[PDB]
A = this chain, B = another copy of it.
Amino acid sequence: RVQHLHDIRDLHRYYSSESFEYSNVSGKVENYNGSNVVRFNPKDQNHQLFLLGKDKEQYKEGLQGQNVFVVQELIDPNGRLSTVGGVTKKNNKTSETNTPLFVNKVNGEDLDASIDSFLIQKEEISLKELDFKIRQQLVNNYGLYKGTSKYGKIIINLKDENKVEIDLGDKLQFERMGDVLNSKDIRGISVTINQI
């Protein structure tokens, strides 16, 4: 599994790929080359979930019915779908939350700036899901990872106390995907895409 997706077409592929959600998942912590994993099967496919970030310590005893946001890294030689983090807690509570999204496309001297909205539907959300769904919104609605759009940052205002900065030029660091944010605490998101 590759951390660093260089090439604009690889980024587009990854952040365009379909993602999934699954509720009430359980699994003991097996290992896999030091990397903690958890094997489960929602229906018709074995998954193995890598716990690398804050989630590694957090779920040292395994998963007892949590929510899991799944993005496909690869299919290993046994047919297991490898995904990393995305583990929110054991009963995210359907909460309609529209948080302001600003997208600013800087092309040389031209600044194209628009207002928008980001839809969260749960009490808390993994940084993996924010990162993925935001970028998927940007790729789909704003031409991210097409043409000269690739570099830039996603800044998130968390309760006016912390800035969560995400670099657009590469895939989100794997060890950050364990992070979990309170949905109601997200005051807003401002994206800026620095066109080459």
Interface of A toward B, CB cutoff 8 Å? 98, 100, 102, 104, 106, 109, 111, 113-115, 117, 151-153, 155, 157, 160, 163, 165, 187-188, 190, 192, 194, 196
The 9 nearest A-B residue pairs measured at CB: A102-B190, A100-B188, A115-B157, A104-B192, A100-B187, A115-B163, A188-B188, A190-B190, A113-B155
Distance from A134 Cβ to chain B, minimum over Cβ atoms (Å): 14
- CB-defined contacts of A111 to chain B, threshold 8 Å: 151-153, 192, 194
Contacts of A115 in B (CB 8 A): 155, 157, 160, 163, 187, 190
Q: How far apart are the CA atoms of A104 and B109 in the complex, in Å? A: 15
**Set of chain B residues within 8 Å of A106, measured between Cβ atoms:** 106, 192, 194
Contact between chains at A187 and B190 (CB < 8 Å): no
11 interchain pairs (CB within 8 A)? Answer: A100-B187, A102-B102, A104-B192, A106-B192, A111-B152, A113-B165, A115-B155, A115-B190, A117-B160, A187-B188, A188-B188
Q: How many copies does the complex hold?
A: 2
Q: Which B residues are in CB contact (< 8 Å) with A100? A: 100, 157, 160, 187-188
Question: Are the C-beta atoms of A157 and B102 separated by less than 8 Å?
Answer: yes
The reply to whether B194 and A114 contact each other, CB–CB distance below 8 Å, is: no
Query: Measured between alpha carbons, how far is A83 from B163 in the docked complex, in Å?
Result: 38
Most buried by B among A100, A114, A196: A100
In the complex, the answer to whether B160 meets A113 with C-beta atoms within 8 Å is: no
How distant is the Cα of A114 from the Cα of B162 in the complex, in angstroms? 10
* CB-CB under 8 A for A151 and B109, given A104-B104, A115-B160, A157-B100: yes
Interchain nearest-CB distance for A142 vs B (Å): 14
Pick the residue among B109, B114, B163, B187 that contacts A114 (CB under 8 A): B163
**Nearest residue, chain B, Cβ from A187:** B100
Q: Select from chain B the residue with minimum beta-carbon distance to A107.
A: B194
